[model samples]
Target: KETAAAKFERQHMDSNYCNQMMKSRNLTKDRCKPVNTFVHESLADVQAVCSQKNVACKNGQTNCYQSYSTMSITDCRETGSSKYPNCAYKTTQANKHIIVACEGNPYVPVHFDASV
Candidate 1:
């Protein structure tokens, strides 16, 4: 059983170049993830995002927050030729402000909404 916060970390907290790294994390199992972003910062920093500048999520949720400082991140995108069971990805690294949806009593990030 995965908690939302834990699941968010599993899906978004790595620092990788993709293919093998993505596979090792089970990101390329059933099908390619299409696109995903990874933050290189500490979990504490990410959790801290819940307390930063607030914004509405794409779904109109008010719990979303944008990081005040840019963070090192890696974006993995599935190649056009990629297919299920043999997923492939191309990586792009950048420094950007991230947006995440927070929840619960401790108010940790539960979803990686976007990066800007």
Candidate 2:
């Protein structure tokens, strides 16, 4: 089983992919994750965002922090025709600053908020 942070990494910390990688990673199985984002930066760099600019998350939480540098990322959005057991996605790659929420004893990123 994966921890929240580990699951977060499995779902969001990758450097690429939508179809093959997504399916290979076990995300496009039982249910498609409507939308997902992959940060291309190193895990160390991404984790460091937890100590960057503190900001409010979309849910109004103050546990989020925005990265100082823009990072390359892949955004996967499900197609309208996407169905379970055969998740399909449209990939969009971009470079932007990302925001993530942190928690736990070491305060590592546990949830990705958005890219700015």
Candidate 3:
């Protein structure tokens, strides 16, 4: 079975949802900036956070990683892993999953686990 992140990537790429998200965020077709949502201070900072949080990894790799460029107009939804941390998303009482909000939309976070 495909993991949630895998599904998210597939759906995100297959749909024009990112453009819709940009529109909702008050960002024009050419002015939306991407922000790194994962809270991190630095590579070392990520390592420390992971260590304190006890996030496990193979080969003694650090957890600090970077993704999602600010210039790209795309909404990326990824799952939590030892290497990559979880991106926060809004969830309903009925379902608990990651949801990626458009840059500035007011709607609740989109659930990553929902059927596309």
Candidate 4:
């Protein structure tokens, strides 16, 4: 399944939706996971990142790509005092290109490298 992408739909589509989505997506099982970035670009534009350009991933993988133009997105960060079953979030909106790494057959964004 497109777990990460699916999770982003709930994570960033709304400002405070992360807390619920985090649990619903089962990401909070062992602590919230997924970069969960919301891209304001069209589907084509978002998927194009896979074939955009080759950039180095933060984990040092030579398989990352940066969006061609700045995109509107929201990042959900866990709060300082956030804890299980009561995870809190701090949502930040930004206009920047997203960076991600793809993998496997018909590779799609699987690893969120960062945004800039």
CA-only RMSD, every prediction: 1.3, 1.4, 16.8, 3.5
Instruction: Provide the clash count, candidate 4.
Output: 0
Q: Per-residue lDDT for 1-116 in model 2, tens only?
A: 99999988888877535877688777876578888888888898898899999999999989999999899999999999988877889999999999999999789999989998
Instruction: Output the lDDT of residue 72, model 1.
Output: 97
> What TM-score does candidate 3 get on C-alpha atoms?
0.19
lDDT of 3: 0.27
The residue-by-residue lDDT of candidate 1 on 31-104, one tens digit each, is 78898888999989999999999999999989999999999999899999988877888899999999999999
Candidate 4 Cα misplacement greater than 4 A, ranges: 1-15, 29-36
- Pairs of residues clashing in candidate 4: none
Q: In candidate 2, residue 109 scores what lDDT? A: 92
lDDT of every predicted structure (CA atoms): 0.89, 0.88, 0.27, 0.69
Instruction: For model 2, give the 10-residue run with minimal summed lDDT.
Output: 12-21
- RMSD in angstroms between candidate 2 and the native structure over all alpha carbons: 1.4
Model 4 lDDT per residue over 1-116, tens place: 65865544444343276666556656676775534665666665666788987889888878888888888877777878887667777777789888877775566676667889
lDDT of 3 by residue, 1-116 (tens): 75543433333322233334434433333443332122212323222222232221333433322222211223323223212121232211221112232111222122121111
Better of 2 and 3 by TM-score: 2
What's the distance in Å from true for residue 28, model 1?
1.3
**Relative to the unseen true structure, what is the Cα RMSD of model 3?**
16.8
TM value for model 2: 0.93
| Candidate 2 residue-wise lDDT at 29 | 64
The list of candidate 2 runs beyond 4 A from truth reads none
Instruction: Order the candidate numbers by lDDT, best to worst.
Output: 1, 2, 4, 3
Lowest summed lDDT across 10 adjacent residues in model 4 is found at 6-15
